[PDB]
Amino acid sequence: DARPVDVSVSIFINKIYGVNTLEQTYKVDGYIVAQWTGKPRKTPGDKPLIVENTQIERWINNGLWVPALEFINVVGSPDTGNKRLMLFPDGRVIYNARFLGSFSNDMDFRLFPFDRQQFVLELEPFSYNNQQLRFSDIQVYTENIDNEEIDEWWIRGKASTHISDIRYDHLSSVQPNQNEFSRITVRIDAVRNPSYYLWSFILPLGLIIAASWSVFWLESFSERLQTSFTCMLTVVAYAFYTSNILPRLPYTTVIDQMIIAGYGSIFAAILLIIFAHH
Amino acid sequence: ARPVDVSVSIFINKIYGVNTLEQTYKVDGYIVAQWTGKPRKTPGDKPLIVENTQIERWINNGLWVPALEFINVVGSPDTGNKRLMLFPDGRVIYNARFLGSFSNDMDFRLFPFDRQQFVLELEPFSYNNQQLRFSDIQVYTENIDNEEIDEWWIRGKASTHISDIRYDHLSSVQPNQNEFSRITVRIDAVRNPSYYLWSFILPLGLIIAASWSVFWLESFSERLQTSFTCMLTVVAYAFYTSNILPRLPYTTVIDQMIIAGYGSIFAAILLIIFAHH
């Protein structure tokens, strides 16, 4: 009895950018298309009717059912651009809207700059349970890339989608079998472009750690030590250089471990020099 | 009924605030949209000026004002004053001030000698080309006195295009109703490299030149200890550079010069060792 409204969704992803490592957020620009069948109506000339922006509100006040679909993992209200409604005489309703939002997800940067990320979008009706509103299908359209060389992230594979049901324990006490919500999940897999960090961090640090062992070729103890402190100062100067560029994180990356290795190599070389003189 | 021909004029006051990592830039200007609507009655049967919040009152009362979307805008543009000029003979002239962050493919690998194409893409949000088409596009840009004081140097006149965008997700929804009219505006510019020439390439050159002067030292003890000092200087210059240079996922001309500076010292160090032991 009283079948839920099947809503068909299409999500267009124009851009994934502005990753904030410490906040575990990323910015997504795109379009959301949602379609369902309502009660048939009289439209001018029996052709579809286009209602956009502030006029949608006028139709809602007058009784038109436009459910609020929430981005579960959005961080603050998404910046909604233009929005329209295509009302068909046959009863169909199509809602299209441009959006820009900051989306959160679990982001592990421990393998940086060689880290892989899954950028997700989670959509769910704000007030209507799956006995009232259910998602029938999800279609994802992503950007057509010419050259990824100039891009920070490298998209790997097609967009992964899911349609699940979210059962809420705080709603069990409210009403029987009315505590489940329909949820669309969209996932974009990407690998970081490590070109800048390979040539500007790993390679020069390697040339320094390689040159750090060349102190053993100095004739006297006074020369070997004074040069080891100079290399120590260089590793600190390099650590200060990396810190000013590298993203803010509560853990250590591959680059951070290499700097600790650089400190270790010098401290080991210093212990070796002392184990020859006295 | 024939599609509505819309004539567009874009005024570009400023192109600034380039964000290299986000591949965005800020554009301040005006958008003028002109079309012929339905004939109407206006006070004194003269053109009628309807401003800002009054536009909304006319739309509620039945006036057709189609929403034209900037395709490559990042977030809702800051719209200043907006105006409608209504004529009894149906004509409508929409004028509005805008400020928006626009995205574009930007390749900064040749920085500071990189060239950019700043584009603005305009398309009706809901009306296909059978309902609404762009008949023409005019672009008016800023008259520059002296570009020496400017970050970017505009090269040539604005390039414009009128194309049709066919959407596959709109087929099997309606036949021959999936195409949209699009205006493309392009501003070509070359970066002003004066600051990076005198403050980055020149001092780095004087350092890479002074790095080979170590071979003129008498002893092996002097040659080596000075090479580590130059190594510290290249790291010092790399951290001076990093603090100024824009954030990028690749290496620039300046970044390659720093790697060359690291390479030159490591080569010089291998040369010193290949003489003593």
């Epitope: 057509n144 | 574009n104 584009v119 392009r186």
Partner: nanobody, 124 residues
Framework: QVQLQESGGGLVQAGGSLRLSCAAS????????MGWFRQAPGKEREFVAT????????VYADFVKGRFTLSRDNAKNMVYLQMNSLKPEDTAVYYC?????????????????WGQGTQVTVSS
């Protein structure tokens, strides 16, 4: 360092159809970079069709007017231009170029590795 090769051109009567094909071979990552252009005697090289930025979209010149369709076979590194309802105005040498740079898919300056071209002749 790519090589582009057009085919499918020829002599057709007004109202007729043709299916142009472009084969890409070399350091090519995607067929999205490929775009069709045309050049009539004593006239400039004009844009015909290319892939749009967002999935499902294709950019067409204002003269196409629904008559031409761009298709692709990313596995075979092929792009096809199905031309229907051909008018004598469509008589030109059709070129297949690859987006070398810039940020305007409509500008021929942003294209390189051009093929020899395929002549299409529409008879009134």
């Amino acid at each position: 360092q790519v090589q582009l090769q057009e085919s499918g051109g020829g002599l057709v009567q007004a109202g007729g159809s043709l299916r142009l094909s472009c084969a890409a071979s070399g350091r090519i990552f995607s067929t999205n970079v490929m775009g069709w252009f045309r050049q009539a005697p004593g006239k400039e090289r004009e844009f015909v069709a290319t892939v749009g930025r967002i999935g499902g979209s294709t950019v067409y010149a204002d003269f196409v007017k629904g008559r031409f369709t761009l298709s692709r076979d990313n596995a075979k590194n092929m792009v096809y231009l199905q031309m229907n309802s051909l008018k004598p105005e469509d008589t030109a040498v059709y070129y297949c170029g690859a987006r070398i740079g810039g940020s305007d898919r409509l500008a021929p300056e942003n294209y390189g590795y051009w093929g020899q071209g395929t002549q299409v002749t529409v008879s009134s």
